[model samples]
Target: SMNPPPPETSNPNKPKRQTNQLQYLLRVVLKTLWKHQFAWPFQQPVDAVKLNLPDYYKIIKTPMDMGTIKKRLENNYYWNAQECIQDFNTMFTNCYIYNKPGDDIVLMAEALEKLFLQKINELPTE
Candidate 1:
């Protein structure tokens, strides 16, 4: 003899769950860049390599915090100029050391610049 299921209480007025495409792309790109950066070969003695590999591993293993940007997007369905600018700055600052020629930075910068400008235009003026 099993108990009956509880009643559903769904609210029609509740906002639908939204996906932040820019945030998602930024997260993916940051991780990919870090992987490529870590794989790059550097000049070092065998003993030096043995000792330094762990340090680099620790650095590579650090997690990226996208919570602030994510929260901002959650509150507002679109990015404001400041949020876009800050996110772009954070992404580049973290990944700059790993960048190589033809890496995603140029592509990302162009895309972000467009979005940043669009966001600026959306603001109300006096």
Candidate 2:
């Protein structure tokens, strides 16, 4: 019988269950795309790849921890506004665009951007 890999640890190299699964799938897709295309194409382009059913399933099933990232922003002293915003955009866009480049995924990307903007507005001014 087939089984998913064991639940991953929360350590940096290995995140929790869904996180690990998602990361693994992303890595595979990125690597495959890199090999296929000379350049490191953007996430939107990756959605066009012809992944098998299992690969596609993994891409959409990976669980993310946005809350943890939110907390991380508070914890890291050196992380500036520009860097944080860029990271947030990359994470949200990559997740949504890599799977669904269609209307739903694009809508999610826009929503994520709005949420991040709201978060930035709520943060204390330095």
Candidate 3:
């Protein structure tokens, strides 16, 4: 039988601050996921293909406006998992394209985290 990996031992001399931060982030993800009721996107419009998101997004120059699309999904009483996933991928790709290598990583992480939380919060309510 294969043995499982041993539990990690804490390195007191190295300090535990980094581990604590990771734990906190994990809690945030779990809490957000749980409070949302494991709700992933559902329901897609029949005319979804007709929605030209990229062109609109380019014109708007603001990913934050994705909330508008989310609202449309809710208004239609439906959601598209594939579109949501694609939007997320696009957002990350755009971020990479827009941000300079010298940009502050901490700030970038904060901004991305906020955007993700906002998107999740805007999802259809139970």
Candidate 4:
């Protein structure tokens, strides 16, 4: 019979490993955000082909725009998962501060975390 894989070892490099995992999770979240943008009603209004636009053209384009934002976070703002979480918290706080009613920020954050957990669980373990 084949042997089961060994458990992850405890190491001083744990922090680095955690950071890598966080980066992977963050990338997954970014991709999920991009995917979610397609479900927005505004994206349905314009048919790119009917408008004689390029194959890559989008109606709302917010999802495409979010790619740049994700890149900025990955490249500059966030050094680890904690930073990402903090930034998200700050954003949600700002929404409340601005008295934005019935905002979807909480829902989106919950959905993102749920999706992240599901993706992490689906990963192959060493």
Candidate 5:
């Protein structure tokens, strides 16, 4: 019986309704970024077959997008500021990986990143 799987517990691990202040703050900032004019390109996960950018799928192992972020936020997948911010950073930088510096998509990522950082400064600091 050595190395047996642990037995499941009855605990449901419900999230505390502590009114997580940081969560609320991050949500507001996320909404601003989501509805941004430059957000169109970054709204959903890239469709490699439709966009005909197969290299994107190959080049980007872990793709990021506003829709994914929103889902994670709504599902309480983000545990803290660092986790949330990391997802966002990846989403923006993924653009750099797939697009040229002069491309409009690149500009969009830049604008969104700037806005994200600007709003980040408004969050509560340790």
Candidate 6:
């Protein structure tokens, strides 16, 4: 016979501060990204025909974007702030790979990354 007695202790997750609070704000940031004027390229996945970049997918795996992140947000795809931040890095890296250093899209990505970094500074506060 297996008994289901458990001992109460420290946090089951980890020592990190609660990611719960940040999740709601994360969705709000996505809303801002959606309206970001310079984020046109990052607003959606690169369209092969419209952009005429047929080989884009070949270069960028797991193409990340604000539009897709919203769906990910609505569906609860990201459970924690760290996980969501990871995806943001993915989007920026993908931009860097596909575009030149001073390219239009790269410029947009950098500025957006800075905006996000500003929020990151706020953090799971005291």
lDDT of every predicted structure (CA atoms): 0.37, 0.40, 0.37, 0.42, 0.70, 0.66
Model 5 misplacement above 4 A? 1-22
lDDT score for residue 72 of model 6: 59
Worst 10-residue lDDT window for candidate 5 reads 1-10
TM-score of 1: 0.31
Worst lDDT window (10 residues) for model 4? 1-10
Off by over 4 Å in 2: 1-65, 103-105, 118-126
Provide TM-scores for the models: 0.31, 0.37, 0.31, 0.39, 0.79, 0.74
In model 4, what are the clashing residue pairs, if there are any?
Answer: none
In candidate 3, what are the lDDT values of residues 3-45, reduced to their tens digit? 2222122233432232322332234432343234212211112
Better of 2 and 4 by lDDT: 4
RMSD of each: 14.9, 14.0, 18.0, 15.9, 8.3, 11.5
Q: Write the per-residue lDDT of candidate 1 for residues 1-126, one digit (tens) a residue.
A: 122222112334544333344444334432333244332221111122444433432333321223333333445433333443455454434444434546665455445444544544444432
Best by lDDT: 5
Which segments of candidate 1 are over 4 A away from where they belong?
A: 1-68, 75-84
Q: lDDT tens digits, residues 16-81, model 2?
A: 232332332233322332233222222222232343334543453432223334343333421245
lDDT of 4 by residue, 7-68 (tens): 22223443433455456545665566547743232212223455454432222221222333
User: Which residue pairs collide in model 3, if any?
Assistant: 42-79, 43-79
Per-residue lDDT tens digits for candidate 6, residues 1-126, read: 121122112233544333554465455566666677887777666675666776777677667776666655555555577666777788889889988898877888898988877766665642
lDDT of 3: 0.37
Stretches off by above 4 angstroms in model 6 are 1-19
Residue 119 shift from truth in candidate 6, angstroms: 0.9
Off by over 4 Å in 3: 1-65, 77-79, 104-126
Tell me how far the alpha carbon of residue 49 in candidate 5 is from the true structure, in angstroms, after superposition: 0.9
Superior by lDDT: candidate 4 or candidate 6 = 6
Supply candidate 1's per-residue lDDT for 3.
20
The TM-score of predicted model 6 comes to: 0.74
